[PDB]
Every structure is written in C-alpha cells, then in structure tokens.
Amino acid sequence: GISRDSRHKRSATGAKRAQFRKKRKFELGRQPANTKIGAKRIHSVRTRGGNKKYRALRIETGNFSWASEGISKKTRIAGVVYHPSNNELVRTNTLTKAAIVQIDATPFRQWFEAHYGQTRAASAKIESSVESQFSAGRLYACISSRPGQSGRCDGYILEGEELAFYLRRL
Amino acid sequence: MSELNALLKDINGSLTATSESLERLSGIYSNSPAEKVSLLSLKNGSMLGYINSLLMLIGNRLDDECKDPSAMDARERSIQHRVVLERGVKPLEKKLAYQLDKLTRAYVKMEKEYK
Amino acid sequence: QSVQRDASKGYSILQQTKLFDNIIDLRIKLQKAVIAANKLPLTTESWEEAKMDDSEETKRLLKENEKLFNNLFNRLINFRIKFQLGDHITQNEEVAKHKLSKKRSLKELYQETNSLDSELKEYRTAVLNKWSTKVSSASGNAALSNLPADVQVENQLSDMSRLMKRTKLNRRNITPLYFQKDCANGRLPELITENPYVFDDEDFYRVLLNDLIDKKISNAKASKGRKLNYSVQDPIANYEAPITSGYKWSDDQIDEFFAGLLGIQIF
Amino acid sequence: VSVYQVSGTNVSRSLPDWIAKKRKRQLKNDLEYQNRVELIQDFEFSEASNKIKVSRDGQYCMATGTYKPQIHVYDFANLSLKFDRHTDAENVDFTILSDDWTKSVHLQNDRSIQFQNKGGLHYTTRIPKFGRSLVYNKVNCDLYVGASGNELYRLNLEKGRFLNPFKLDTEGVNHVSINEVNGLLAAGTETNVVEFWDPRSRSRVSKLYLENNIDNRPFQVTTTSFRNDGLTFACGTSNGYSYIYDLRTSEPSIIKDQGYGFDIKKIIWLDNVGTENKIVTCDKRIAKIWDRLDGKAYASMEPSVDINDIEHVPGTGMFFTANESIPMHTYYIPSLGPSPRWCSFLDSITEELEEKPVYSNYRFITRDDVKKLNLTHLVGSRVLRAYMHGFFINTELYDKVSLIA
Amino acid sequence: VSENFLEKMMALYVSSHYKNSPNDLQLMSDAPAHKLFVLLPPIDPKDGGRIPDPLCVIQIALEGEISKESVRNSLSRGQRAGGDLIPWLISQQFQDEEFASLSGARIVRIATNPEYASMGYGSRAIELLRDYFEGKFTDMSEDYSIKRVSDKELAKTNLLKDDVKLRDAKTLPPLLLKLSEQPPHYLHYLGVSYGLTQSLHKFWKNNSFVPVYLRQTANDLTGEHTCVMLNVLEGRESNWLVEFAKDFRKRFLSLLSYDFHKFTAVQALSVIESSKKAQDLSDDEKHDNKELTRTHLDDIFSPFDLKRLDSYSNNLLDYHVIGDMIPMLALLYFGDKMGDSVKLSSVQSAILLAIGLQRKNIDTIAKELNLPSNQTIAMFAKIMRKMSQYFRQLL
Secondary structure, eight states: OOBOOSSSSOOTTOOOOOOOSOOOGGGBOOOOOOEEESSOEEEEEEOSTTOEEEEEEEEOEEEEEETTTTEEEEEEEEEEEEOSSOSHHHHTTEEOTTOEEEEEOHHHHHHHHHHHOOOOHHHHOOOHHHHHHHHHTEEEEEEOSOHHHHSOOOEEEOOTHHHHHHHHHO | OOHHHHHHHHHHHHHHHHHHHHHHHHHHHHHOOOOOOHHHHHHHHHHHHHHHHHHHHHHHHHOSSOSSTTOHHHHHHHHHHHHIIIIIIHHHHHHHHHHHHHHHHHHHHHHHHHO | OHHHHHHHHHHHHHHHHHHHHHHHHHHHHHHHHHHHHHHSOOSHHHHHHHHHHTHHHHHHHHHHHHHHHHHHHHHHHHHHHHHHHHTTSOOOHHHHHHHHHSOOOHHHHHHHHHHHHHHHHHHHHHHHHHHHHHHHHHHTHHHHOOOOHHHHHHHHHHOHHHHHHHHHBOSSOOOOTTHHHHHHTTOOTTTOOBOSSOOOOHHHHHHHHHHHHHHHHHHOOOGGGOSOOOSOOTTTTTSSOOOSSOOSSOHHHHHHHHHTTTOOOOO | OOOEEEESOOSOSSSOHHHHHHHHHHSSSSHHHHHOOOSSTTOBOSSOEEEEEEOTTSSEEEEEESSSOEEEEEETTTTEEEEEEEOSSOEEEEEEOSSSSSSEEEEESSSEEEEEOSSSEEEEEEOSSOEEEEEEETTTTEEEEEESSSEEEEEETTTTEEOOOEEOSSSOOSEEEEOTTTOOEEEEOSSSEEEEEETTTTEEEEEEEOOOSSOOSOOOEEEEEEOTTSSEEEEEETTSEEEEEETTSSSEEEEEEOSSOOOOOEEEEOOSSSSSOEEEEEOSSOEEEEETTTOOEEEEEOOSSOEEEEEEOTTSSEEEEEESSSBOEEEEOTTTSOOOTTSGGGTTTGGGSOOOOOTTTSEEEEHHHHHHHTOGGGTTSTTOEEETTEEEEOHHHHHHHHHHO | OHHHHHHHHHHHHHHHSSSOOTHHHHHHHHOTTEEEEEEOOOOOGGGOSOOOOOSEEEEEEEEEOOOHHHHHHHHHHTOOOSSOHHHHHHHHHHOOSHHHHSEEEEEEEEEEOGGGTTSSHHHHHHHHHHHHHHTOOOOOOOOOOOOOOOHHHHHHOOTTTOOOOOOOTTTSOOSSOOTTTSOOOOOSEEEEEEEOOHHHHHHHHHTTOEEEEEOSSOOTTTOOOEEEEEEEOTTSOOHHHHHHHHHHHHHHHHHTTTTGGGSOHHHHHHHHHHHHHHHHHOOOSSSOOOOOOHHHHHHHSOHHHHHHHHHHHTTOSOGGGGGGGHHHHHHHHHTTOSGGGOOOOHHHHHHHHIIIIIOOOHHHHHHHHTOOHHHHHHHHHHHHHHHHHHHHHHO
C-alpha cells in the first residue's frame, strides 16, 4: 500500500496530475519499524534482489563507542531522553537514528580503571561533564546506526560541544 | 572522652531539644468561644503529668548524691498518669471515637467550602 | 447556628489531637534523655569514679546539665500551670498567676508538681465519672441497670505493687555505669531481668508511638491537516445512526446527578 | 482460587520465545507437543500484539499487531483466523462500532483515524494533533479522541464533520471513557486531575484532584472506567495505585497498590460475571483481581511477559491478555463464572491445563527505595523477602514506613 | 407544619406498599412500642429551617422481654398473644424459651423514594439505625415529656365552655430530634419480616442480617414466602443466633424438595450463604461442623456404591447409574461434613443443589443457568471426581 511514486503529487505549477498508472512493485515502501526498548526482537525482510534487511522491532543492548578515547563496548540502553525530529518518540521510548539515549556506564568505567588505573594523570583527564555523568551512572549517547534498516543500535557517547548543546536542549 | 561525658552531652542536647519543642508547644496553645472537650483535654493534662514525672526522675538520675536512687516518687507519679491514659481515658475515646471523628469531619468540610 | 456550634466543637477537638500529638513529640525527644538517665552512675562513689576520668570537662557539663534541666523543669511547670488554668482544671486563677510570675527553685518546683498532680487527681474523678455516665446512658447501659472509669482507675491504682514490678522489668537490658562495681561493694541495697533502679516504660512508649502513627494514616499551517477543518466529509457522512431512546437514565435524573457530581422547632 | 492458562507461552521469562520455535523442531518427538492444546488457531502475531477486544455479539474477536501492522479478526464459531488486514502504521486504540466485526475505527500512531468496513479501508482522516485514546458515544453519534494538545477533539460520524472541540485546562489526554448510563466523558489528563464533561451540554461538571499520601512524586492518570451501575468510577495512576471513586463524594473509597511501581494499563469492571464487586487492574508485569468493597485480593494472573492490554469475555471466565510475545495469552478463571459457549468442552480438559499458582499479595521494593526509607537495618529480616533485585514487604508496613519518611 | 411533614412521611410510607390500609396510622400513633425514624438530606443553612423531604423512613416496633412463665403457659395453650410477632414465631419454631426473654426491635417498614431506589440510601439508614442502638451516638455537649391534662382541669371545665385548642407550641418538643439527644433502648437483636425476593434478600444480606426462619406456605396475595431475618448488635451474646442459623440451614436443605422447588437455584444458594455468614460471625470454635467419620461413611454408602462412584469419575459409567446417590451427597456437602478438602464454584454449587435437593432434571438446570446440557454434565462429573478423590483419601 505504501508508495514512493511522485506522480500523485501536484506539479510544480500546482496542477493536479491524473493517476497515470497502477502502483508498481519497484516503487514500494514498508511500514516503519518503531524500535522500542526491550528484549531483542528482530525479523528479516526480503528486499529487492537477494538482499535482506533486519527490522529491529525491540532491542535493549548496543555497541557504543567513546570516540575521544577510541574504544567501543557493549552496553544496555537505559532510555530515550531527547529526540530531535519529534518529541513523542521520547514519550514512548522509541529508538531511531539521531535519538539521544542514556546508556549504562559500567563497562566504560571498568575499562577506564583498567587502562589508566584511576577512578599519566594528565592523559587520564576527561571533560568535567563526562566525569559527572560517570558519577551519576548513565551516559548520554547518540545512536548512529539505523535500527529500522540494519537491526543494530550502534552509536557513540556525546562529548564536548555536542554534549553542551544537547544538555542545553534537555 | 569519658563515658559520663558522653552521657551528659547526650542528655544535654536532648534536654535542649525538649526546650525548643515545648516553646513551640506553648506558642501554639497561646494562639488557641470555642469549648474544649473535657475528656481529650484531660488526656493532654494527664500526659503532661507523665512527662513531668519522667523529667523529675531524670533529675534524680542527674543528681550526683543519689539519695533516693530507685526514684519511687517519680516512678509512682508516672504510674499514676499512665493508668489514666491506658485504662481510664483510652476506653472512653474508642466509645466516643465515632462521634469525635464525625464532628472533626464536619469542620474540615466546612473549612474547604470557605476556602 | 447549630452547624456553627458543631463546627466550633469540631474545631476544638482538632487542637486536642494536635496538642496531644505535640506532647508525643515532646516525649519522643525526651526518650533519649530517659535512656541516658537510666545508664548514669547510681552511687556517689560511682559518680566520683565517673568524674575523675575527665574532671574539668565533666564539671563543665554537670554545670550545664543542671542549668538546662532547671530551666526546662521550670518551663514545663509554667506551661502546665497555664494549661490547667486555661482548661479550667484549676479554679484558683490568682494563685496560678502568682506561680507563673515567681521564679522557683528545684525544691519549690518539686512542691508544685505535687500541687498540680493533686489538682488533676480531683479533675479526673469528676470528668471520668461524668463521661462514664454519658456513654453508659447513650449505650442503654443505664436502661440495662463495665465498672465506671473513675472506679476502674482506682482499682488499678490500688494494685500498685503489680504496676510497681512492671516498670522494674529491664526489657532493654540497660546496665548502669559502674553497676557491677556498686553490686560488688554492696552499695545497692534494693537489689540485695527485674532491676529496681532501671525504669522501663518502653511498652507504654511503643503504644503511644503506634497510636500516633496510626492516626496520621487514618487522616491520610493548515497543510497536513494541522488546522481543524469542519467541512463535511462525504465518505464518513451517515457512517452510523443515533439511538432515539437516549441514555438509560431519564433526562431529569441525569441533570440532577450532574449538579451533585463530586459535591414549632423542627430541628 | 485456581487460574488456568489455556493459550500462552510456556517457556521461562529469561529464555525468549523465538528460540522455542527453533527448539520446537527438535521437540516434535516430545509427547507434550502432541498433547498441547490451543483453542483458537493462529492466535498469535508475528512479534507482538497491542490491543484486543471482543465484539458485542461474543462471536468475533479483534486485535492489532506490531509488524507488519496487521488487524486480525478471529471468528470464535470456526476457532480460526477469519482474515488479517494490513495497515500503514501501528494502532494506539480502536473501537468496534457495529455489533459485529464489520465496522470499526482505529486511531493509528500517525495522528490518523482509519475507518474500515468489511471490504477494507473506507476513509482516513487526520486529527490536528497526536492522538492517545478513543471512545464512541453511541447516543449522540460522536467520536471523542484524546489529544496531546489541550483541545479534546470531537468528531461526529452521523453528520460526517468535526464539531467544536472541548477545551481542557491542561495539555494531555492519556485516556477517555464514557459512563453508559449517564454519559459523563471523563478525560484523564497528565496532571493528577480528571475533567468530567457533560456531553449534551458543553461544560465542565467538575474536576477531581487525585491525592497519594504515600508518595510525593507527581503522577499521571493512565486509565478511567465506569461501572455499569453508573455511579462508581475508577482511576489508574502512573505510580501503580488504583482508585475507586464514588462520583457523588470526592474522597477515594479505596486505594489499592499493585505494588510494582508500574502504570495501570487497563481497568475492567467485572460486574456481569457474578459477585459483581470485583475489579481487575493490569500492569506491565502483573494483573490482579480484587474485591471493590473490601480490597482483599481474589486471584491474580501473572504471565511471564509484559502485558500490553487485557480484556474480559462478558459473562464468562475467559480473559484475553494482549502481550509483548508471539502468542496472545488466554486465561480461564473457573471460579468467577462458566466457560464460554464456544469453549464447550474446556471444562472437561481442565485437569491437563497448567493451573499456574505471594507475589500478587505483597508489595515490591527496589534496593534504592530501601535506602530512601532507611529500612536497611531490616535487610535479612523476616519482614523483607527477596526476588530479583528487590525485596517484598507487606503493604501496610510499607505505608507505615513511607509516611514515617 | 406537623401536618405538612406528616403527609410527606405517609407519601413515602404508602408509596412502597401495594395496598395500604388506614388502620396502620393508628398503630403508628398510639402503639407505645413503635418509634419513627426519618433520614433527611443535608440541611442548607440558607433555607431558614424549611422542612426537608424525607428520603428514607423507618418504623421500628420494640418487642420482647416476655416472662418465661408466660411463654411456657401460653405455648402449652397454643394461643398467640397480640404483638411480639418475632419472639412468638421463633419460640414456636425452635421451642426455645430464652429468646422470648431477649429484647429486640422489629423493622416493621422501610421505605425509600422510588425515583432514588438502589442509590444506596437504604443501606445508609439501616447502618445509622444499627449504630444508634449499639450506643455510638453518645451526647457530646455538657426533658421531652409533655404535661398531661390534670384531673383538676377536667373537673373545672363545663361542656358548653370547653375551649378545644391546639396545644401551645412552647410545650411541644421539637419535631425532629438528633440521635444524640434521646437515649436508645437496650436491645439484643433487630428483626425483619418480608416476602422473599432476590432484590430484597440481597439488600438485607448486605446489611448483616441472618435468616432464622422461612414460611413453607407461600403467601396467597403475593405468591412469596415470608422470611424472618435477624441481626445481633455488637456487645451482645450471639450463640443463640448461630444455633438457630445452623438448625434453620438443616431445615432448608431438606425442605427444598417439598415446597421450595419453585425457587431458582441461584436464589436458594444465596439463602444458604447468608445463613453460613452467621457462622462466620461466631469467632468461637465451640460450635463447629463435624467431619464425617469412617464409620459414618460406611453406614451411608456401601462399598459397591463407592466403587460405583469411582467408576463414574473414571467415566466408565452412565450418569443414570449414579442418580440415586446425588441427594445424600448433596446433604453431606452442604452440611459441611466433607470439610475444607472439597470446595466448589458458584456455578457448580448451583448445579449440585438442583439435582441433589431441588430434584430438578439435568436439562431443567441447563435452561435455568443458560448453559448447554453437555457442559452441565461435564461440570457435574468434575464435582463427582473431587468427591471420589476425597473418599479415597479418607479411606
């Protein structure tokens, strides 16, 4: 039923074009994948060609990357906090790309103690806000993957002016 | 720091707290023609006697000389007020509880309407 | 007028609860003092043995302890005198005002406690017998004619010895300072677990706290359709038909309930 | 009281269902597979269900799914899937206008309302702002749709036109419900208030401020329902507390705690079945049946997966619970009433049912709350009993302690 | 004013009754045992004392305190004295002398505004009325007799000059009295006499009354059976009610076949529950139901009968083969001899009661309960299976 054909729209002049032809299979769309936090739950989608797309209907874990330190760890996703496109995705805790989520900081905390031996010092120094978040127990991260296409919720921890701007918006 | 020093200090602060709360208690009473219920009033008058007996027992406990250490006089008075609350006043309140609650319920409703 | 009288009594009843609840708060604060008091040294020698540990510091605290206690036990008597006066418990207005005006020593204050107790003792006999009569007649016990409260109070009071032993019970297992030393030296004649010198009113204390806690609980732009368009829509026109019978309740009854929603001498 | 689960997932909570299908080909040999019994064939969405309701006839059951967003319409007479129709988005709510399955209204998650006849989608209309609930007043032929905005939008199917919206003091409408005998349209806003509206007139009959003495955390109403008698009323708070208000007086008759701190997703007034004084409260994890007058729990139905919505087949013991799992669970409480007509021989086979059996009785407290309440000293005492990451306590003791704090 | 109020009372009073007679007015006015109670809405202070319409009116008749010698002497003569209905009936049916000596008040009539029926006002009035006699409405603030015409005044008045006037208002007491002002009479029980209907029985069952008697002969005018229901106030002896409630329960179970076969299965069941609630009122364990003994079982049922029972549970028999045993099984279960081991749902209890005691055919139950015959038999077999298992356990 969903279609991407541009024939139905009005012409640039504003004329109402007539229905040229029936809907074709090569111009289809599929229903959105409202990823919500919960037990992992994905089903494959057989797309054009032999390719396959994974639909992340539900997901609770993701690989998140600390870019400044250039490390990546698998962490649980606590909950959505702020989403730029629409707010009501925040209310229902829906996951999509560019959504800001709160992730458990425990693996990063353990790794940091392992690598730096601190709860040498100048390198260990990190932004004040990130240390405050570590104290809190949850880290603000931005999802970089597209859960409705690849079935993953990979992303990275907010840092610097990213963190400043999003904290202001919060 | 001697064990007695800790006890004196613990008594010292506890007594000081007793002073502030009593001063607040006196002020609230002074703020409070509305007719005061006799039985419930006696309950308060009875209990203030009980607290008075407790303090005068403590005073005997504070006294270094300790002439009457078992503190029969303070202990007897504490019994006197205790029995009145437990055995005399308390059964009457339960038998009067329903009408007391109803009367109080009437006021809070009216005060809401005025507000 | 009658509603106003009921309201005023309802008002008056409340402060008695609030005033009582405050007195509970007074007892709660004093609970630490009573526990510390029972632990204190029991004899002059133990008190002397206690003082030597920190002579200067103990001397300072003992002086401070005397002052605040005397100021307190002064203050309680003043409030008690005022309370018994305002509630008409004491009828001699002039004497009460004189007592408030004059400062009192410890012995004089001890004397006043006896006078206040005696005034209360007479008041209890009148009030308890008064209310016992009211309740029994209300219950029909007068029509029936369970002992009167004033008589009940005396019977328990006559049984002082059992009340004597209940307090001596050391439920808390409090051990006074240098208690073992005084026992070894035969300085504690009464003893020569129930300890006469230790006072335990925790059972009464626990009942009061339970009563306080329970009372609290009982009291407790147009694009995308973002602008509304009221123009008729043919596909949904006449999608369904109304029921002519109407709501189950009559229109009158419905109106009355909505109005009330969420709130000769005849009388 | 005995509770029998007729249809549902039988695996443990930790082990997810899709593995069960993978194991199932390995478990074809086991006698349990041959002996396992399901009433309605294909009584399952691909990944999960959202909302399930039974038609007035009692002949048809309707549901909505996660992916692809589908609308199954089960026929009881044939114990089968009569038809499944796809949609363009997920469903937040729907109501079956006609007595049968024939005619229905769906509020999707894209601010759209869809009208579906037998053949298929009939017409689509889009309300000005996002919708959250839906109700139909049959007498006036008006469709009332809750909205994230202050306006409570009103749509008239008979005249086929939006009429003037009802303005509400606060912005947000989580649920709407209509008193059948009266017609009061109780709107449950995000703040602790329910705005009761006369439908015939356009007025605010009153507003009811909910109060929770135990907790100071602000809470949101999530569900409202009226009893068929017409005078009693219900509410569900975001803190997990359900209330029963008698409309004539503002004070709450009872404040029962489910205890898990999870919102109250639906409330069903079990008047018809028998022993009318029973009310069902549903949470994310547990649903409990308790008497409306005394507050004593009767029986509780705990599935091993989150409950999205529950519904009661009228005049029977069957309980349909829409879950977040592939099968849609069915519950039969024999004590309440007889089994439905279409499950004639369900009674005979009662023994082979699982007969699933503390947890519904007590309240659940997390570790953090224990520190907040300074109940740490009781850790390890008989007062507090453990299960997953929190301890259980008696509801009265919790209310005793929380007030103290 | 009193005339205006009197009419409003009679309007509410007469409205409930099908065909009232004028004589009851005299009974209300003259009879010393009768007192009138009125439930009034909240009075607005702004009304200036305007009489509010009565929402519920209760007429109670005080009864009891009969001398034991009078009870024994008149019972031997079989003569009923005028008044004191409930004491006389209960004494006759139970042959107990103690109850007649007890004091009670009978609720002769209760009426509520028909438009406001079912709104819960009826349950409020009884609740307040019950609390009144228990003694809860005690006065909180620290006479109503009228001076009678003296013989001297009567002697000094001449027939021609006699000035017949309404009594002066100052002498008269107030028309409506707060409950606190006038003390209640000491009472042991409150009683009701009414024709058995489902709406009424539910109303009284909710108000903590207990059934003690049911008249076998249906009333000719109404077709209903008169029932006597009693309640014991707090702080009074309760054993006698418990003994009556049990014994009446035993009468009902056997009597269901003779004349109460017309009663619906649900209605008959509810009466049992109300009586059983009386047992719950007795916290004492002195009077408790006895579990059936092994010897008692053998007397009732032979070994072949038990084997016949078990085979049906295994579905190796036809239903007709166990038709003979259903009534005895019904008596044992509803008598509570079987104990906590066997419990049944509301529907199953209704089914067993019908075949067992009503002696109704299986198809008749299917229609009354709106179930198919197949399910009714299937549910019944489950009841038997529970019963067979218990006998196995006891053996």
